[PDB]
Each structure stands twice: as C-alpha cells, then as structure tokens.
Design a protein around this ligand. Structure first.
Ligand code: A1B1I
Ligand code: A1CCA
Length: 479
C-alpha cells in the first residue's frame, strides 16, 4: 500500500522532471547509440536465418546435422533474452547491455578462428546468448528518457536500425562469401567465412564503444534508492538539451526527487539472491494484477512472431519455385529482397510514428494486424516473382506498425522495476515462436502454396482478435 503510493509519486515527479528537461540532442544521441546494438541484433538474426542454413550445404554434414546451427543458436537467443531481461531489473540497463554486448562480441570474434563444426556451434550459441538480451534492454532504456507526449513516436523509429543490420549482414554475405564453400581451405583470403564472421562483429564493437559514453537510466537509480546519481544524470540531460538549443543560461531547478527504499561462498550467496529476485520478478507478472495482460501479450507476440518467421522461410522457397517454373518453360536475391523490405517498412514507420500518440496504441495494433492478415492472404494470389516481391513489400509495410505499437504497449504496460523482466520473457517467447515457425514451414516445402498462407493468415487473425482486449496506455505516466 505504501510502496504503491511512493511509486505513483515517483512516476508523476519523474514525468514532470522529463518535461522540464525536454527532448533534443541527448535523446537523439542515445537513439543512435542504442540503434547500434539493435543493428547488431539484426545482423545476428540474419546470420542465423540465412547464412548458416546455406553454409550447411557447403559444410558437408549428416542428415542429423541439418537444422542444428539455427535451432541451437535460436535457443541460446531465447535463453539470453530472459537472462539479461531479468538481470537488467537488478543490475541496471546499461550494465547488463554492456555485459551482453561484450559476450556477443567476444564469442563472435572467437568463432572466426575455430577449426571445427562443434566448436563453431558452441561459439555461435554463446554469441546468440549474448545478443538475445539487446531488444528488451534497449527499448526500456530508451523509453525511460522519453516524456509521455511523444514517447511512442520516438520509440517507433527504433526498428530501422534492426532493418539496417539485416541489410548490412545480407550485403556482407553477398560480397565476402558469394556462392563459396564454407569449410573448416578458406585461409582467411578476404573471401572467407572467417572474414565474414569478423566483419559481422563490427556493429557490436561499435555499440559497446558508443554505450561506454552514455549514462545509466535515472529511473533505475530512483527505483533503487540512488538519488544523487539520478539527479546528476537528469542534470546532464537538461544541460545538454539546453546548451544544444542555445539556452546555456537555464538552470536545472530540481532539488529533491522521490526515491524508493571464502570468495566463492560470497559469490554463491550473492548469485542466489540475484536469482531469487529475478524469479520473484518473473512470478509477479502472473499475479492478479498482471496475469490477464501477460497472457494476452504472450498470445499476440507469439502469433505475430510465428507468422512472420514462417513467411520469412516460405517466401524464398516460393521465389525459387517460380524461377524454376519459368526456367523450365541466391545470396544477391536475399540481399535485394531485404533492401526492398527495408525501403517498404519506411512508410509504415512514418505512419506509425505520426499516428501512435494521436489515435492510440490499441487502434494502431488492431488495424495493422487486420491489414497484415489481409496481405498475408493476398500473398497466395501472386503468380510471378515481381508480383510476389510487391505483395511481400506491402505486407511488411502494413505489418511493421503492429510491431511498433506492441513494443510501445510492452514498454508502457509494466512497472519500471519489472519492465525488462516482462519484456525479456516476451522476447524469449518470440524467439520460441520464430523457432516453431521456421521448423513447421520448412516441412511445407513439398506440399503446396495455399496451405502455409492460410495457416499464417489464421495465426494473424487470432493475434488480431487477441489484440482487442488489451488496455489503452495513451496519456498515462510511465509506470
Ligand atoms: C531487413 O531484412 C532483414 C532484417 C533482419 C533479419 C533478416 C532480414 N531479411 C529477411 O528476413 C529476408 C526478407 C524475408 C526480408 C523481408 C521481409 C518483409 C516483411 C518484406 C520484404 C520485402 C522482405
Ligand atoms: C525491432 C524489433 C522490436 N521488437 C521486437 C522485435 C523486433 C525485431 N523484429 C522486427 C519484426 C519485423 C516485422 C515486420 F512486419 C517486418 F516487415 C520486418 F521486416 C520485421 C520481426 C522481428 O523479430
């Protein structure tokens, strides 16, 4: 009872202080810094989705060792998302993001020098574990600096870096290793998979370097009884914004902010305390206040991720089938399709950013889910490569807005002390949905076109039906 009152006062005062600080240079600099980490995450997603499965053909492997790489790295990403999301509520957003990016970079670097398939599997699994935690931490970290007036608009532009990371991975795959033999022979002669792996690790290193310059989230400090650090961070934000805008004479007027109050044996007891706190935070999401919201968010996230990652493997096989049919009358195609998808998402991002705070998160999510279902059903009517590409671009452009709205809802539906835990759980569920979608839609290669399309459309329809029951968060202070 007392704690809820104190946290409500803290949220109100934090929104007032964010309004006093304003929006400007600091927020955009942090936006680029966190976009670097999102770009690294997109690079890893593309590498798991397209590079490794094609490389498995070159690396002669048994029938048992066909799906192995992608499956196990996605499982590592699923584990890491939950782990780092849980730890971010206890150690801090910046600290856990730095640790996860360091793990990802170190093991991506190590994977280049391996001389075995199993060692490469191990290194890439650990790299996936490191990279899994980026999205929840990045989104919560950036949201805790945005006022309620335009938080949704500024959060909607974060996925462009994920798209750019996918495009960068596709371009580097096409350039460094086009139709080459992935063997553990390459001799690191530039056109090598080792060189490709080394180049793919640059965004993570740059993200670490940039993130070392940014301050920890002051909301985390306030929620954990660190008044002075949060005050210093807020003063830094205010001074940066006012100096950038040409008003260095303005003085930060905030005085006091509401605050909430052998070696291996010690490490063990501290780690047990951390684990207990993380488990308690996870179990709190299924309490009487948040259980229904958690279940509905789980359903919507699972359906959207399942449909998207099913289509990501269904579409290239359909393109290959159409090309074969035309002929009977690789990497560059994937890169071109990724570039076109990144271009087509941009109008959807513009519309979502401009309408999120104007019409609300619920209407955006519902309309975009309905349009995504309609476009997924429309995908079945294409009968040529160009028509299929245009329909997929339309589907992506209409569907990205639902993802943006769901990110905003996930940020705003949970309290600050458990936001990253809930987001990490939902992102791990999304990774599981991606695994299931890829595995199931791979079995559909030999059957027909219509059935996978109908399956994905039904999943999107279920997600749209579930989206209607979520509560609206527009106009509220950040919990
Ligand atoms: C920007 O890409 C990516 C980003 C991150 C990871 C992978 C990719 N790339 C793909 O997954 C290939 C292709 C299916 C992307 C795509 C998606 C949509 C909805 C429409 C279009 C035209 C392309
Ligand atoms: C950035 C992000 C934020 N929150 C959760 C997950 C993510 C990462 N994404 C984006 C999603 C997506 C949706 C689309 F409709 C597209 F067209 C597209 F290309 C990609 C798929 C995914 O896993």
């Amino acid at each position: 009872a007392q704690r809820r009152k104190e946290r409500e006062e803290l949220a109100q005062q934090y929104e007032a202080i964010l309004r006093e600080c304003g929006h400007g240079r600091f927020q955009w600099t942090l936006y680029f810094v966190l976009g670097l980490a999102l770009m690294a995450d997109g690079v890893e997603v593309f590498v798991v989705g397209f590079v490794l499965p094609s490389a498995e053909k070159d690396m002669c492997l048994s029938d048992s060792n066909k799906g192995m790489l992608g499956l196990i790295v996605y499982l590592g990403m699923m584990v890491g998302a939950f782990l780092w999301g849980g730890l971010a509520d206890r150690l801090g957003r910046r600290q856990c993001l730095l640790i996860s990016l360091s793990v990802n970079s170190v093991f991506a670097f190590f994977s280049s020098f391996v001389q075995g398939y199993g060692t490469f599997l191990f290194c890439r699994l650990l790299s996936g574990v490191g990279i899994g935690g980026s999205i929840p931490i990045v989104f919560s970290y950036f949201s805790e600096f945005l006022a309620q007036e335009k938080r949704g608009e500024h959060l909607s532009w974060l996925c462009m870096f994920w798209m750019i990371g996918g495009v960068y991975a596709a371009a580097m795959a096409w350039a460094i290793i086009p139709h080459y033999g992935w063997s553990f022979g390459s001799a690191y002669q530039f056109h090598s998979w080792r060189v490709f792996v080394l180049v793919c690790a640059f965004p993570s290193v740059f993200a670490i370097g940039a993130l070392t310059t940014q301050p920890e989230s002051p909301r985390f400090f306030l929620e954990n009884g660190k008044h002075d650090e949060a005050w210093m961070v807020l003063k830094q934000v205010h001074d940066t914004n006012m100096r950038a805008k040409g008003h260095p004479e303005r003085v930060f007027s905030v005085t006091h902010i509401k605050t909430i109050h052998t070696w291996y044996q010690r490490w063990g007891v501290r780690a047990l305390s951390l684990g207990g706190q993380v488990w308690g935070n996870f179990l709190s999401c299924f309490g009487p206040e948040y259980r229904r919201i958690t279940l509905m968010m789980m359903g919507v996230w699972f359906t959207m991720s399942f449909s998207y990652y099913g289509l990501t493997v269904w579409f290239p096989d359909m393109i290959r089938h159409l090309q074969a049919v035309d002929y009977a009358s690789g990497a560059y195609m994937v890169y071109f399709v990724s570039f076109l998808g990144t271009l087509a998402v941009l109008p959807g991002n513009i519309v979502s950013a401009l309408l999120m705070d104007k019409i609300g998160r619920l209407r955006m999510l519902a309309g975009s889910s309905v349009m995504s279902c309609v476009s997924c059903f429309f995908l079945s009517f294409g009968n040529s490569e160009s028509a299929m590409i245009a329909l997929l671009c339309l589907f992506g452009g209409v569907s990205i807005a639902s993802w943006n709205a769901l990110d905003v809802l996930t940020v705003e539906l949970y309290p600050s002390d458990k936001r990253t835990t809930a987001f990490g759980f939902l992102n791990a569920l999304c990774k599981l949905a991606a695994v299931l979608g890829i595995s199931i839609f791979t079995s559909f290669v030999g059957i027909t076109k219509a059935a996978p399309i109908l399956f994905a459309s039904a999943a999107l329809a279920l997600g749209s039906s579930l989206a209607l029951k979520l509560p609206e968060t527009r106009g509220q202070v950040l919990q």
